Amino acid sequence: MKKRVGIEALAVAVPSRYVDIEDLARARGVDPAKYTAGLGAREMAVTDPGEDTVALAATAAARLIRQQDVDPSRIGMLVVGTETGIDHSKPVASHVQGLLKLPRTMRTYDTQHACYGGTAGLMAAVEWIASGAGAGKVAVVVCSDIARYGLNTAGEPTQGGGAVALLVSEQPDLLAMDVGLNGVCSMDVYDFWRPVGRREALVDGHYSITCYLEALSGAYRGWREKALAAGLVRWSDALPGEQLARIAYHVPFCKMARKAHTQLRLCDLEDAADAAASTPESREAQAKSAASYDAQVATSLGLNSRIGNVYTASLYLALAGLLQHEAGALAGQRIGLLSYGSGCAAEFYSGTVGEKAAERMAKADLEAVLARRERVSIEEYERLMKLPADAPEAVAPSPGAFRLTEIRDHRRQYAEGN
């Protein structure tokens, strides 16, 4: 009689190539430690035009269906969160439906708000099910993006690309979400944006970090109030946020997770009924606790550090990395998730990891996904960057994966790997 809803499983797709981030530093005249220590990066996914938003989304969604033995006719919603759209009207979701040969009894659409678009679609799918409308069916929500700032830009070492496909159902083996407890904070800003007809993003980098932390603070506080009233956390000898077993954050670069966690802890320390007894110095020293970061956040960054920013998918890659190794230990425990998108909006939500989470993550076979990639030179990365969007390289997709092959008469053509 206890109904549940949330994420049942996930799958990951990554571009076929990456570069070593220290190679990028040397090519840019930058100290490699700025990237490896300052940003937390190790490897950066790079793309060619054949690895477009559709190809990556379809690869991830097809992999989800195969790895988890999803019955395609049970999918009632297919949503793609992206900020790398390829048509003003025709959604990536419709291309994915066709490439996967999915049947007709489903909503299809894309959701857009920078790196928050995937979470927006996840909540639409969750609440479709939780309203009863989706009872007996599942949704697939795919976060797919290619993050491009441009050669010789400050954002360049945070680039990346890929997709995460989420299975959403009444059997949320990965994360049984606490419906209705979300905190949200949004405001109209120009921290990061990408006008139509611009291939590379515009960004005010340090301002965008301030906006992330400001929106995080509002979203987390909103969740905390509802979690307090639902009895899930208390003001005790432990801070409210310390009672979450883990917290995953949107990862534009890996060091951002430490900034975010410090800010979240500062929200508890500033808001405690006895905060007047503290100073900025004592609060910051407690908030920055290495023990808390190590216990709640550190193990969520293994995949992100090898891929880069994947915009809508970055938070879900962090969820994936966390559960990849700790799903069994986390079963029955509640964790928190912070989604941010520039523009901007943040949402903080929680859920309980399922008993079968380890099973579902084993089937995602994520080290095999990352192992199929190949390293290229910075010179080759630059050559591929300069290719127009309609000039895919002449290479076949891996088995079950997809590539854009050409655009003919304004129609995009794809190939599936044998």
- Catalytic residue, chosen from 115, 254, 267, 344, is 115
Residue 240 binding target from ligand CAA, its own copies, none, CB below 5 to 8 Å by type? none
Instruction: Indicate the annotated binding residues.
Output: 31, 34, 154, 206, 208, 259
Residue 154 binding target from its own copies, ligand CAA, none, CB below 5 to 8 Å by type? ligand CAA
Residue 185 binding target from its own copies, ligand CAA, none, CB below 5 to 8 Å by type? its own copies
At position 377, the amino acid (one-letter code) is S
**Under a CB-based contact definition with an 8 Å cutoff, are residues 346 and 316 in contact?**
no
Q: 292-331 mask for ligand CAA (x: CB under 6 A)?
A: -----------------x-x--------------------
Burial 184-223 (b: 16+ CB within 10 A, else e): bbbeebebbebeeeeebbebbeeebbebbbbbbbbbbbbb
* Site residues for its own copies per CB under 8 A: 76, 83-91, 93-95, 97-99, 104-114, 116-117, 120, 123-124, 126-128, 130-133, 135, 179-180, 182, 184-190, 192-198, 201-202, 218, 222, 341-345, 347, 410-411
Q: 326-345 mask for ligand CAA (x: CB under 6 A)?
A: --------------x-x---
Would you count residue 155 as binding ligand CAA (CB under 6 A)?
A: yes
CA 158 – CA 25 distance, rounded (Å): 12
What's the half-sphere exposure (Cβ side, CA atoms, 13 Å) at 359? Answer: 8
Whole-angstrom Cα Rg for the chain? 20
User: Is 10 or 256 the residue whose CB approaches ligand CAA more closely?
Assistant: 256
Instruction: Indicate the annotated binding residues for CoA.
Output: 31, 34, 154, 206, 208, 259
148: left (phi over 0), alpha (psi -120 to 50) or beta: beta
**Under a CB-based contact definition with an 8 Å cutoff, are residues 230 and 257 in contact?**
no
CA 258 – CA 289 distance, rounded (Å): 10
Binding positions for ligand CAA, 224-283, rule CB under 6 A: 250, 252-253, 255-256
Sign of the CA dihedral with 143 first, then 149, 151, and 155 last: negative
Residue 115 catalytic? yes
Q: Where does this chain touch ligand CAA (CB under 6 A) — which range of 30-38, 238-246, 299-307, 368-376?
A: 30-38
- Rule CB under 6 A: choose which of 109, 190, 200, 205 binds ligand CAA: 205
Would you count residue 38 as binding ligand CAA (CB under 6 A)?
A: yes
Burial 312-322 (b: 16+ CB within 10 A, else e): bbbbbbbbbbb
Residue 410 catalytic? no
Residue 89 binding target from ligand CAA, its own copies, none, CB below 5 to 8 Å by type? its own copies
CA 120 – CA 242 distance, rounded (Å): 26
Largest CA distance in the chain: 69
Cβ neighbours around 111 below 10 Å, total: 23
The nearest distance, CB 328 to its own copies, in angstroms, is 30
Give the tokens for residue 350: 């929680």
User: Is 127 or 284 the residue whose CB approaches its own copies more closely?
Assistant: 127
Give the tokens for residue 246: 């883990």
Residue 143 catalytic? no
Report CA 274 to chain centroid distance, whole Å: 36
Residues that bind ligand CAA (CB under 6 A): 31, 33-34, 37-39, 115, 154-155, 158, 192, 203, 205-206, 208-209, 212, 250, 252-253, 255-256, 309, 311, 340, 342
Annotated catalytic residues are 83, 115, 250
